Amino acid sequence: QGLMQFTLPVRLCKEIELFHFDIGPFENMWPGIFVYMVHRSCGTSCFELEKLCRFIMSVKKNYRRVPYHNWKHAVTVAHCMYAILQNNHTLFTDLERKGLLIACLCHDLDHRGFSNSYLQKFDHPLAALYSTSTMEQHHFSQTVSILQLEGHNIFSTLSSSEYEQVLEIIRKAIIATDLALYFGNRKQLEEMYQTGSLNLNNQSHRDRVIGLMMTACDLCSVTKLWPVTKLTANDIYAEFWAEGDEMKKLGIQPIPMMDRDKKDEVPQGQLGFYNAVAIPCYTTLTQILPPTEPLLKACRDNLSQWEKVIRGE
Numbered sequence: 001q002g003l004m005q006f007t008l009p010v011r012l013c014k015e016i017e018l019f020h021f022d023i024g025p026f027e028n029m030w031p032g033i034f035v036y037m038v039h040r041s042c043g044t045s046c047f048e049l050e051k052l053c054r055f056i057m058s059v060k061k062n063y064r065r066v067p068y069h070n071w072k073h074a075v076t077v078a079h080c081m082y083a084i085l086q087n088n089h090t091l092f093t094d095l096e097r098k099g100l101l102i103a104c105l106c107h108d109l110d111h112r113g114f115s116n117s118y119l120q121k122f123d124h125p126l127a128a129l130y131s132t133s134t135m136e137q138h139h140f141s142q143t144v145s146i147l148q149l150e151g152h153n154i155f156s157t158l159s160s161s162e163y164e165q166v167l168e169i170i171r172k173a174i175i176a177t178d179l180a181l182y183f184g185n186r187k188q189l190e191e192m193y194q195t196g197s198l199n200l201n202n203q204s205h206r207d208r209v210i211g212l213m214m215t216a217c218d219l220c221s222v223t224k225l226w227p228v229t230k231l232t233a234n235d236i237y238a239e240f241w242a243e244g245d246e247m248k249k250l251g252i253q254p255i256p257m258m259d260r261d262k263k264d265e266v267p268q269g270q271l272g273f274y275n276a277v278a279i280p281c282y283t284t285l286t287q288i289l290p291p292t293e294p295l296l297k298a299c300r301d302n303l304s305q306w307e308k309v310i311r312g313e
């Protein structure tokens with residue numbers, strides 16, 4: 001695999017450490033950037049080199065050519081996690097860092113470009129399969145599958161006790177990317193910080209904290225520079241409207257978010273999403289992990305930009 005023979009250009013190493021880094025212009029290097037981020041945080045000799053490169057390229061194969069939930073989004077989510085882990089060096093374990101970077105790379109595995117609402121409505125084999133968090137359990141299942149391929153188990157050169165630790169950590173992280181679960185997860189995190197009940201030693205509090213980090217990296221396109229954040233918004237709407245198009249073909253009227261005929265209300269839609277979802281998430285993450293403040297600042301910068309779009313300013 002050429003992945004082994006790849007090294008990152010020196011001029012990008014400081015740019016990759018920035019929270020608002022955009023991997024967009026470097027598609028050829030995306031598999032190597034993940035190797036670089038694994039080797040930077042976890043170090044070389046953490047994974048057997050060849051098995052790590054099979055895994056990444058196999059992980060890439062199982063990402064479809066959907067407009068948003070694709071291979072570019074997996075590495076983009078994985079970079080923000082790497083940026084979070086690098087700026088919180090002492091507060092996460094060795095098995096957490098390597099598990100979470102793998103989880104973010106696999107958190108949207110085999111996405112077809114469809115909401116959980118769509119699948120749980122048009123009787124798809126995935127919704128008769130997993131009744132809740134439909135795509136999420138399929139993502140973790142596809143992850144367990146790839147690990148068990150020949151010469152791919154990057155984690156079985158490790159205990160069968162340390163093994164199922166990292167796999168549960170991976171499962172929780174991938175399940176936590178279900179946005180419907182984020183609202184409750186965050187409101188309990190907010191309360192524990194009010195009363196001072198947040199315990200890093202308590203492992204069920206760790207899982208809530210990681211889940212919010214998973215939500216933060218999943219939405220990290222709002223924490224990029226305005227030209228990058230704007231263009232990415234086109235990608236997720238093109239995948240939404242395509243799902244809404246398939247609903248109109250059955251006589252079903254989609255919700256305006258999935259309706260391409262209501263493009264003009266996207267700016268007011270983003271502003272509502274930032275205030276209801278994005279800003280609370282990064283504000284809560286910043287309170288628990290102060291070094292994650294640039295994500296909250298960059299999100300504020302993009303909210304003001306959507307503010308200007310609405311007003312013509």
Ligand SMILES: Cc1cc(-c2cc(C(F)(F)F)nn2-c2ccc(OCc3cc(C(=O)N4CC5(CNC5)C4)c4ccccc4n3)cc2)ccn1
Binds near residue numbers: 220262267268
């Ligand atoms: C896990 C997850 C992530 C994302 C996500 C990631 C990212 C990014 F890639 F950036 F990271 N973005 N998103 C994202 C995509 C579309 C969104 O859509 C909001 C909206 C609402 C209305 C509406 O109902 N409204 C607004 C209204 C009040 N004045 C008009 C009525 C809407 C209406 C018309 C047109 C467009 C509209 N869009 C919001 C966010 C999305 C969903 N789940």
Ligand SMILES: [Mg+2]
Binds near residue numbers: 107108
């Ligand atoms: Mg997902």
Ligand SMILES: [Zn+2]
Binds near residue numbers: 077
């Ligand atoms: Zn995702």
